[PDB]
Amino acid sequence: QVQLLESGGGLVQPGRSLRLSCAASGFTFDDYAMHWVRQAPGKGLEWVSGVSWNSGTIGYADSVKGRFTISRDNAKNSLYLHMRSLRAEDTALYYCAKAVEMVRGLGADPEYGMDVWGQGTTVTVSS
């Protein structure tokens, strides 16, 4: 069965670094565009970042652009999310989701359809 396991949570004082890792198991990891979506405590979702099938990122959120850095590894089926300039606000759950349409399966390449969702971590930051 498809498995999306993420790891990296833990309280880190603001002004430090974080490297979340998502592991995929049960499908061809190179035919699906990954996504990272946060989840504020008791609030709505908010898209963070993503990556296409070919290890090319698709931009970050407007309020987060400048610090986060996503990276993919198809050899180990691992997605990583380096985090910089941590602040008190950057406390939320984090899911790594997958697209639905396989690449070249029908105009352009697909990026929509976050269908499978792993159980997110509980990253929090406090002084």
Partner: protein, 49 residues
């Protein structure tokens, strides 16, 4: 030129070999179905860093 002589005595001699020549060229191969997915690399929307 076969007997290596000028005068040729009466008889039946064998001189050479009548042979037909090929006409054109033929190449064969079953219908081709697999094409390498180069477009997916060359026409990719976004390259990696």
């Amino acid at each position: 030129c076969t007997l290596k002589s000028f005068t040729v005595e009466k008889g039946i001699y064998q001189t050479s070999n009548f042979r037909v020549q090929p006409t054109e060229s033929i190449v064969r191969f079953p219908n081709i179905t697999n094409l390498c997915p180069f477009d997916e690399v060359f026409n990719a929307t976004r390259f990696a860093s």
